[PDB]
Design a protein around this ligand. Sequence first.
Ligand SMILES: [Mg+2]
Ligand SMILES: [Zn+2]
Ligand SMILES: [Zn+2]
Ligand SMILES: [Zn+2]
Length: 134
Amino acid sequence: GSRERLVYEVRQKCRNIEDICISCGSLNVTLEHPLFVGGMCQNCKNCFLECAYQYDDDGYQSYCTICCGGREVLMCGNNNCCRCFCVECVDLLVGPGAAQAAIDPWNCYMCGHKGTYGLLRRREDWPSRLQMFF
Ligand SMILES: [Mg+2]
Ligand SMILES: [Zn+2]
Ligand SMILES: [Zn+2]
Ligand SMILES: [Zn+2]
């Protein structure tokens, strides 16, 4: 329950989101997350690299953009994107109830006009950051 407790501490202004891995909750941050404000640990970086741009038979990405896992997911309707975000990450980082409110069509957090969704904030330079990340 480390990720949940740490996100709660972020909300209570007792912790900077840059100091936690937003994917798994590890405090062993080794880089800035390339897509969102917040940290990332080296294990999650490796997972992100290995899971990036793998696709299920429905044509959408296999693995949640944030935690690299997921079962029930929100799926981006932008065909140039095709990303998925699991309901657990959305309820944690956007906030309680956000996932079931996000369920037409749906542009994901990387594609929408707004970049701030609760504690989830899209990085300005994310396309170029991905180039450096990969
Ligand atoms: Mg799967
Ligand atoms: Zn991690
Ligand atoms: Zn997730
Ligand atoms: Zn998208």
